Amino acid sequence: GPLGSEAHLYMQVQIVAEDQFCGHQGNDMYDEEKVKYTVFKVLKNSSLAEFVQSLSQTMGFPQDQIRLWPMQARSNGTKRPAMLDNEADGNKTMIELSDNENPWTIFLETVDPELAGATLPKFDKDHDVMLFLKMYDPKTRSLNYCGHIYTPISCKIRDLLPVMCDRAGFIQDTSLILYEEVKPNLTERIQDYDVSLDKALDELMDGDIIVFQKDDPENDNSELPTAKEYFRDLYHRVDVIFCDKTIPNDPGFVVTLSNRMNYFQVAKTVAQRLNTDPMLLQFFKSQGYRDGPGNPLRHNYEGTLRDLLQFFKPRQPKKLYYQQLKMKITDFENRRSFKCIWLNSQFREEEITLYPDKHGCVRDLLEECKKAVELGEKASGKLRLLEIVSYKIIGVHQEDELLECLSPATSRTFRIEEIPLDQVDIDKENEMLVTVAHFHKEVFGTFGIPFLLRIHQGEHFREVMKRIQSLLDIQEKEFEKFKFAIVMMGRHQYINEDEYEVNLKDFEPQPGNMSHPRPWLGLDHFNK
Numbered sequence: 001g002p003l004g005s006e007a008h009l010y011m012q013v014q015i016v017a018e019d020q021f022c023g024h025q026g027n028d029m030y031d032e033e034k035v036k037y038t039v040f041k042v043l044k045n046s047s048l049a050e051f052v053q054s055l056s057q058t059m060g061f062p063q064d065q066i067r068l069w070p071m072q073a074r075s076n077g078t079k080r081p082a083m084l085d086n087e088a089d090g091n092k093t094m095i096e097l098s099d100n101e102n103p104w105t106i107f108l109e110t111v112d113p114e115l116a117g118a119t120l121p122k123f124d125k126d127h128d129v130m131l132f133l134k135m136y137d138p139k140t141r142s143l144n145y146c147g148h149i150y151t152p153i154s155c156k157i158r159d160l161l162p163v164m165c166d167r168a169g170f171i172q173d174t175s176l177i178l179y180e181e182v183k184p185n186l187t188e189r190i191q192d193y194d195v196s197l198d199k200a201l202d203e204l205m206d207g208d209i210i211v212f213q214k215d216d217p218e219n220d221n222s223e224l225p226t227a228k229e230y231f232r233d234l235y236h237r238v239d240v241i242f243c244d245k246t247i248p249n250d251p252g253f254v255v256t257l258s259n260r261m262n263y264f265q266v267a268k269t270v271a272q273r274l275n276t277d278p279m280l281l282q283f284f285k286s287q288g289y290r291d292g293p294g295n296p297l298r299h300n301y302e303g304t305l306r307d308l309l310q311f312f313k314p315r316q317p318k319k320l321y322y323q324q325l326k327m328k329i330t331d332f333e334n335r336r337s338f339k340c341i342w343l344n345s346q347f348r349e350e351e352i353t354l355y356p357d358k359h360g361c362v363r364d365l366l367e368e369c370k371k372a373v374e375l376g377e378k379a380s381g382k383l384r385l386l387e388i389v390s391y392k393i394i395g396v397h398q399e400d401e402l403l404e405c406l407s408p409a410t411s412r413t414f415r416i417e418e419i420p421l422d423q424v425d426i427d428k429e430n431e432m433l434v435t436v437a438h439f440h441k442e443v444f445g446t447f448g449i450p451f452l453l454r455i456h457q458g459e460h461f462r463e464v465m466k467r468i469q470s471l472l473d474i475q476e477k478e479f480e481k482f483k484f485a486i487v488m489m490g491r492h493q494y495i496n497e498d499e500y501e502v503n504l505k506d507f508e509p510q511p512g513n514m515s516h517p518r519p520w521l522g523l524d525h526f527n528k
């Protein structure tokens with residue numbers, strides 16, 4: 001709006017009291033966006049002494065009870081209180097002390113208004129340093145402002161250990177770990193307490209910060225055992241929205257994490273936020289273009305959370321998608337669907353998907369299906385796996401074969417069935433299984449449900465027909481309507497059903513030839 005004629009002669013002076021330092025969890029003394037100031041509009045060329053007496057009357061403390069420490073920015077990017085000499089700069093101008101920083105911030109040390117009172121201790125500009133103290137509690141992972149101290153440069157670090165303990169509520173003689181909080185993402189441990197402050201601290205200045213904590217075994221029970229780790233985590237912090245993909249339109253919940261986290265750490269933060277096993281969750285990389293879940297994140301991901309978020313533009317809402325699982329994410333990742341046909345005791349087909357071990361044998365699949373189905377009444381209770389192509393059985397698979405060695409279900413159907421009673425242990429000297437398929441007129445025109453059939457040497461074809469129809473169930477002048485043939489690689493010829501006696505070697509391959517083209521029995525009727 002309209003600036004006054006003499007507005008350029010004035011400057012802003014923001015006074016911060018030490019109560020603003022209490023509760024601060026970050027680096028330095030306060031957050032510039034949360035701090036509350038007492039604001040003064042003062043002439044740029046008023047002197048320091050004028051401001052001091054003015055401020056002393058404004059705040060209600062005599063000049064004996066207050067001291068001014070300008071908040072000066074350091075070369076390393078921090079802002080810290082700094083020394084200001086009363087009877088050597090008290091007549092320099094406010095703006096020349098300011099170094100032309102127009103909103104000029106100053107920390108006002110006062111005596112506790114609890115007294116008045118004894119005045120602030122004197123302070124030798126040359127041999128004394130004002131240090132700031134923070135205590136780090138690893139159990140609550142928190143910072144606790146512990147005030148400031150006047151101390152001689154020559155004082156030994158060990159001599160500061162009492163007051164620290166005193167200000168933290170620790171019992172005296174508690175062993176401590178001490179750090180200088182140099183700057184964000186740099187917390188340097190003070191390794192020798194038996195040396196002076198000027199030797200122990202990097203570039204000893206007024207406004208330096210010592211963070212201290214107990215030396216305690218229980219520290220290792222926290223996610224952040226040291227102040228060093230705490231400040232690293234804080235520097236790498238980032239809020240991320242998490243959304244369940246299975247719940248449509250979910251707004252999801254904000255979780256505070258750190259850019260340096262690996263898969264296990266973010267998984268456990270989110271799992272405790274959801275109260276589940278971290279292993280019963282699956283996460284998804286971002287699609288990287290528009291909001292929506294991307295590719296599944298393998299549980300053994302080697303990257304960091306920063307890699308997962310690198311595609312979010314500098315102010316896009318960071319968001320990751322997950323879903324909750326019914327099994328551990330490892331088993332979820334290694335399960336493989338095997339879809340096949342279960343043929344029940346009624347001779348009817350159903351589609352069933354089993355999830356055995358991807359490295360299992362055929363027996364694993366057979367037992368997975370046996371757990372799912374109701375078997376026949378007084379039946380064998382043992383299952384077998386058949387491979388069907390174009391309505392013909394081409395193979396019986398033995399239980400020791402590896403599953404991954406089987407052709408995928410891509411027009412080649414697999415059929416699990418219970419073995420009939422007459423087929424569990426056939427007479428190996430005179431009894432044989434042959435495959436049976438339905439065809440119409442010509443052999444390559446197959447249809448229907450093929451099956452395995454036991455036949456006996458010397459038997460008359462009549463009884464083969466009887467057991468065929470017993471397992472098939474169809475009107476008898478419907479069953480009598482059709483013919484029977486023996487088939488080998490396209491060639492076929494019919495059995496005289498009036499009087500033929502079953503000779504097994506009419507159905508036998510060439511001796512020594514276990515190849516997949518075996519002779520089979522064909523039923524020749526009409527379809528539907």
Ligand SMILES: *C[C@@H]1C(=O)O[C@@H]2/C=C(\C)[C@@H](OC(C)=O)C/C=C(\COC(C)=O)C[C@@H](OC(=O)/C(C)=C/CO)[C@@H]12
Binds near residue numbers: 112113145146147148
């Ligand atoms: C943040 C702590 C708090 O909640 O209040 C304590 C004190 C004040 C707010 C102020 O006390 C004054 C000015 O009278 C100044 C801030 C502190 C004073 O501490 C000292 C003794 O310098 C810092 C905190 O107090 C402590 O450090 C305490 C109570 C240590 C336990 O003896 C704030």
